[PDB]
Amino acid sequence: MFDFSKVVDRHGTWCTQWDYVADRFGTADLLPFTISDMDFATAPCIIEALNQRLMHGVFGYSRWKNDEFLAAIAHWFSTQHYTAIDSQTVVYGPSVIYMVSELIRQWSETGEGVVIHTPAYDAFYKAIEGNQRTVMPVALEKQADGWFCDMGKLEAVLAKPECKIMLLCSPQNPTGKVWTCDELEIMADLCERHGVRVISDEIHMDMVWGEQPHIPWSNVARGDWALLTSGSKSFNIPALTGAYGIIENSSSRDAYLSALKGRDGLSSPSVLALTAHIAAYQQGAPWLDALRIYLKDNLTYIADKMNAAFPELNWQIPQSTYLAWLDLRPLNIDDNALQKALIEQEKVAIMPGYTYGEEGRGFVRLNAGCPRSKLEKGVAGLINAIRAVR
Amino acid sequence: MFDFSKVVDRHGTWCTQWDYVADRFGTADLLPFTISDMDFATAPCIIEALNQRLMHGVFGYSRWKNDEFLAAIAHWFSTQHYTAIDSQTVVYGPSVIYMVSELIRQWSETGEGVVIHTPAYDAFYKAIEGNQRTVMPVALEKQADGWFCDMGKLEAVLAKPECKIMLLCSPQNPTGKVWTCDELEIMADLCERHGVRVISDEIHMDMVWGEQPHIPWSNVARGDWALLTSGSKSFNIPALTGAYGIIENSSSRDAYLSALKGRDGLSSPSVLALTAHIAAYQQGAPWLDALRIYLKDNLTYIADKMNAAFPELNWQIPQSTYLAWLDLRPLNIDDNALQKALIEQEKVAIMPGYTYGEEGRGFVRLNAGCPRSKLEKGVAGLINAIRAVR
Amino acid sequence: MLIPSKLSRPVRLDHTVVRERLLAKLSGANNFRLALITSPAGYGKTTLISQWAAGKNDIGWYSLDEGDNQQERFASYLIAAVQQATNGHCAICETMAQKRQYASLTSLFAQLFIELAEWHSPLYLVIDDYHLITNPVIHESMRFFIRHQPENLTLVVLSRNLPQLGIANLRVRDQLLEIGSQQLAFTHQEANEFFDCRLSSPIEAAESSRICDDVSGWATALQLIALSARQNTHSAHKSARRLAGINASHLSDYLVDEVLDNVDLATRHFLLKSAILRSMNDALITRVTGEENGQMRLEEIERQGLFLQRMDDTGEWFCYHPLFGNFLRQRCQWELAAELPEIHRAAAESWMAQGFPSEAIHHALAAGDALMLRDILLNHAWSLFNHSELSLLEESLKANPAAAIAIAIIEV
Amino acid sequence: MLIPSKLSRPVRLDHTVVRERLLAKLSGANNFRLALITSPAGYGKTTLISQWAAGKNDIGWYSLDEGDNQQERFASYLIAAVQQATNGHCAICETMAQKRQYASLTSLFAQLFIELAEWHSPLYLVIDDYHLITNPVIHESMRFFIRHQPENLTLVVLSRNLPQLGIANLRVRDQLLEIGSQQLAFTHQEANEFFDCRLSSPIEAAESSRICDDVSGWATALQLIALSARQNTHSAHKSARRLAGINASHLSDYLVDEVLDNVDLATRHFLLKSAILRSMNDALITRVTGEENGQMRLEEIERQGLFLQRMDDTGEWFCYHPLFGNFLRQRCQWELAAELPEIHRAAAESWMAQGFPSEAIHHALAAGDALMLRDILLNHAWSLFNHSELSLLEESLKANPAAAIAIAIIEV
Ligand SMILES: Nc1ncnc2c1ncn2[C@@H]1O[C@H](COP(=O)(O)OP(=O)(O)O)[C@@H](O)[C@H]1O
Ligand SMILES: Nc1ncnc2c1ncn2[C@@H]1O[C@H](COP(=O)(O)OP(=O)(O)O)[C@@H](O)[C@H]1O
């Protein structure tokens, strides 16, 4: 079938992981685990579809308000998340974060707030403060089994007269928490009661490992809302910029479309991104299932090795991602010492945790979306660098 | 060598010209001349380069602050416009209009003005008013030989305490006027004297037919300025969204880069757009020269046929474009009657002139960037529809 | 007023096979929150629901049409179905629905559940053809409904495809019972029984089974072969060959060739004219088609097997099967494109005569007769105001805008 | 103060060949606004410009270095060249440059042109190595200069590549004279003459011609083969084979193998130490290298043919050819990486001794000696304030950062 147990070079292709030391490191001869793409080649169906769109030759203006694009999106939702969508509400955007920022500019003024769950994805802070909107964070709490938002503190935050938007990352990043039906119910009710619109970033929707399925925002969605996503992380094609979303209250959908086409002139899509998304959603299910199996095997290998090297970790593989958010606090080790040991004694770049702010102290973020050959070296390096500084 | 005397189907490829009647027409069985791309297939060098980037397979994150991208841009400028550039001032953007809008948001407040020359490109009004900045127009005046901006009225406009930006389209659109050295000198001096920054949109820089060549903004540029362009119109690849520009006063370049990467999350480029631009600029000169010859032949064929059918037109081919901005006012004909005759009696869609506002009354805009087979039908249709309503 | 044809369980199962395979599956429907039956049109799922419902009395029924896509009318009809299921028990919410003194469907449903909690017996509510709803507000409110309904209530939704009801939530908590397309198809034994009960010549069982699979057990396909053989058009296998794997477009020209051309032209005109009506009874028939033995005509049509179905046992209201109905509409918009506006006007005035201004408005705007709406308004301003058909009013005039200006001068 | 080595025309006339065609091309340089000479380093274009300048007296000269990339120093040196070309005629702009009472380079140049218009004789100004300028303000001001200069002035710019001077504007109006890379290369006859005048063994023209083309007529290539044959390293064709089509990297290791290893180690140390100096005279040599017969050492080096060139006929100042100079710098940063800071300090204090605080600052920040800058400051606060070297002061502090923090405390 498919083979993921092979290394593609990725040298000399301008890629931010293998071709650029700064600022991931300084030695430039490291094994990189810092950036959150996957080392795999995308699905052969997407490649063949692009190859066939290339033989056409002409690359004139194209339209995204298609009929095959929307049909493919609806088919993906129905057969992979058992959710039905009104395909006349799907909108296009260059990137997920662009749509997030546009909606923030639309559903709030300057100086008002945007709730997020921390440790949050990096770019969320950039998008929120770049528009001069204040971040209002709510910390997930790790305990016995996974991470748990405390609805008391969340409701206390939402009650503020300034909080207008809730930027929900589902599945969460980097913890990998998949929200349960009950959590989504309560969050939606609280948001509706306190007049807070919701933006649901769901770009990780496909990489779920738990036995409970991820639940879409639209099923619990009320009034104005938005569900933004892309097949980039799922199929490893972020180099073909393109994202889609679902905005409701057609007045808001229309305001967004006006801003996208008129004010910022971004309406012309990338015809190859649409070709990739169509081919992926209509024929990329076997490839994606094989990849899911492989990524779960990698995560469980990490868990075995680590929990066997230091019996007092008790690390469980995350609910849904291919990014291990390792908690090293039960080892009483200092992170700067660990980072120096990793860089110099071992030559392995592993993104530290304090870059996520204060909630990240004591963690590391290990990209597991790579062939096992590389993962073995990475985890051996981490184990050695821990022992050598313990 | 190359062959442009052949018709590519372009049916079923989502293209806004051949697949979408609305709102170019209503009959949906027309010969379309409304949208400003070219019916040609792009250069075989670009196609081969994309094809070779596809066989790699991986489409992870990429970087535009490259060394081959910048080298190709500098080589293009030096060998095609005899202008040298500091390649560490080149910035990237998703589209030309996006960069225009970002700079407008940066170099002015709300309610201030943006000078443009009318008849202006359509999207300029959208970008200027979408940001709630008032347009302050200056009308070119057609006379004996081409169009002439009157520097008296231009200076009168610039003197306003509200005018802050000048959005210079060079070569102009749709008139096709190429500014002379003296015009550029005087405009730059006037702008500098009255504290107006300049944004030079130069996306047509390559399609110049006159004997006097195109002079970039940078040679006359001072203080803060910007020169935005792309190889999209030149090589007919707008379906691979990507544009570049040169911003000066590194504080402004840095503010723009911050807005592009941080606030709007658009920094990840389209690796295939960069591949296309590199291949085009390093190897696409023979193709472009052949295409230049063909387009000038098409424009002169239009001129021959029209000026022979109605000896009182006296239409000269434009200075630089592949869009004929035909002046039909010396025929005393009504445009709505002409448009109805063109749609119904002839089945030929030709963009009317009044869509450019009041300065466009009496003109039509005929896309000449097509094989001659189609151009013959288009011009025969226009001649017939004129005679049948004369 | 409420069109009775929309609030009654279809009947007239003169020759319907009954299969436990599906009735057994539905037997436990009280333990769940939602029974979702989905398949393309013509499955016979609606016939099964009517069968399953013939053995209950505390069960409301609600058939949908595109006009239901407005929210106030939707609420009115839904509360009507609830009353029929509980025998007038929910009076307060009924008056709130008739007087439109509710802020939003969710508040109306909260009030309904206050009353619903008191009822202690199993309750059932059937909503037919949910795919015709495209209003997002209605979807939202129906999700709220399913989330907050009392446990003794069970909702039954018949739809063409997966609806936007928050189904994944229910599937997670095992509160959902589904009967998909595959289960609804006729098996070999059922096809044998069907061709036995309906045909003049008996068919060997294997031959019926061969007809059964090559058409995928699709019910309306079987009905087509049956009625074709009734007139002895073909031997069965030839008609099945004509029908095997037929798509929407080929179904149309098949209907054109075999069902329209094998009747007399008078009945053809009758069908094409009557098609534009949503629900038909004797009065509307005799008004639009001019033929006076209207009830005679309808009952004889139903005897002929042309996809006409009652909507109550009293034989009062009738409806076409949506496939055949839409086909007849599209064919009439050509064969009689000239005679459309006067036919729409006759239908509209006949509707108003029976006391239903809303269908009159629909058919009038179909006709394009402004002064028709003028007379509808000065003839029922009393009921339009006292029953507050205000959104009806805004859409109607807004949908002759220079003539509509009237609403402009009314706006201030 | 102004380093004289930067304001004087190089004057070496030993084995140089006279190229008449290029001089003819330059003969009409007064009719144009700009004479642009561009080629990779080692072309000999600078030698041609000096040859073209040996026959004029009213001609200023200005050699550039990376330190010129600051604007005030640039203006000072440029006005100095103008004075040398007009013999002190422009006094007002000179005092304005020395007192830095100008808003911007454009206003200074406007004042200069007021004075420039009065002069009635042809004027010439040579700016060497313009590729070292990367300041956009300087580019802008030089474009203004070229646009507004009086017609009797002609600007000559020597550069590696096309500069940002608004050249297309001039090319349109035919106010530009270019001498590109191709014209500057030595032809066959010129190569014959060159090898004749410089070698101890006569070279057949065809063999010289083969050596001429296979190295593309590149001047410094020829000089390399010549000096190699002077020590009788090789027969000429073998060295040419070693040099044919050589890139930057292979030029480096060629220099390492053939020019550095074929001298005595004392001279090697002399070269490697002296390389870090921009312009060298006897005093700086005897200070840094410790060898006391400094002028003797320099003149004997220049005799040996190691790319040392005078900067005036008085034999006072010397400079390395930028290729060989940068090579020696990169090699010294390894062979003597340990001895760098004390050498930088000696150079800095010797510069200050001669009255030039700016080069002292440069070499000190190269050494990384904070208290060295402290002493430079308390030793020349009088000249730093009276000659207003304030931007020098601001930059230097960031590169004694705690002292810069004290400067930040001074900031307020
Ligand atoms: N049990 C049955 N026995 C015989 N015929 C049936 C049976 N069920 C359905 N049919 C035939 O198939 C058609 C089914 O229509 P149906 O699918 O119930 O409409 P809907 O679109 O509302 O679901 C009917 O016309 C009926 O004649
Ligand atoms: N006319 C000539 N005769 C002999 N040798 C020359 C002549 N011109 C240049 N050269 C040699 O070539 C080199 C040219 O250096 P040059 O290109 O003038 O430096 P720059 O980088 O400033 O242009 C010098 O070292 C010189 O020895």
Author numbering:
A (entry chain B), B (entry chain A): 1 to 390
C (entry chain C), D (entry chain D): 1 to 399, 405 to 417
Task: Provide the authors' own sentences about this structure as they appear in the paper.
MalT is a bacterial STAND that controls the Escherichia coli maltose system.
Here we report the cryogenic electron microscopy (cryo-EM) structure of an inhibitory complex consisting of MalT and MalY, which reveals a heterotetrameric assembly with a stoichiometry of 2:2 between two proteins. After 3D reconstruction and 3D classification, a subset of 176,969 particles were used for final refinement, yielding a map with a global resolution of 2.94 Å. The MalT structure that is well defined corresponds to the four N-terminal domains of the protein: the nucleotide-binding domain (NBD, residue 1–181), the helical domain (HD, residue 182–248), the winged-helix domain (WHD, residue 249–336), and the arm domain (residue 337–423). By analyzing different interaction interfaces contributing to MalT inhibition, we found that MalY binds to one oligomerization surface of MalT, thereby inhibiting MalT activation by blocking oligomerization.
